């Protein structure tokens, strides 16, 4: 639920919508969630993806090559695809399974990996970030400086 999202995780969603709009896409899919995670730039998700060599411009290029740029930019809110909804539901599940009381960028990316079957997943693999490796990078950051920060 968005009430439990951190400020940074809410920004991921807002940026995902902007990324769909700039591509003239009429639904926010997992590929746009991925773009929002990268565009946010500072959280666990962005750091994990950067560490595997994934870039904002590379993902944008792949989305344009796989889906195609749309024809007119939509106005207003852009609805989630069914799969993007599933990913956001899984972000909540991932936090619950870990025992966490918040939803951060880490959990959005973990939910994306857990669903594992949409355009973001296709793009990640094509660009050299295996889904299991993305998950490992996220978990390693959680076990490291995130746990350190919580203990201080």
């Amino acid at each position: 639920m968005f009430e439990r999202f951190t400020d940074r995780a809410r920004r991921v969603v807002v940026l995902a919508q902007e990324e769909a709009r700039m591509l003239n896409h009429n639904y926010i899919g997992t590929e746009h969630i991925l773009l929002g995670l990268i565009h946010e730039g500072e959280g666990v998700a962005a750091k994990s993806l950067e560490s595997l060599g994934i870039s904002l411009e590379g993902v944008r290029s792949q989305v344009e090559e796989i889906i195609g740029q749309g024809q007119q930019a939509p106005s207003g809110h852009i609805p989630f695809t069914p799969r993007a909804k599933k990913v956001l539901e899984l972000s909540l599940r991932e936090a619950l399974q870990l025992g966490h009381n918040y939803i951060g960028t880490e959990h959005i990316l973990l939910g994306l990996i857990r669903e594992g079957e949409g355009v973001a997943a296709q793009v990640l693999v094509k660009l050299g970030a295996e889904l299991t490796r993305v998950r490992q990078q996220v978990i390693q950051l959680l076990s490291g400086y995130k746990l350190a920060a919580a203990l201080e």
């Binding site: 809410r10 807002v14 809110h77 989630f80």
Partner: peptide, 7 residues
């Protein structure tokens, strides 16, 4: 939640 945006 869970439609679009932060809804």
């Amino acid at each position: 939640x869970l439609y679009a945006x932060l809804x």
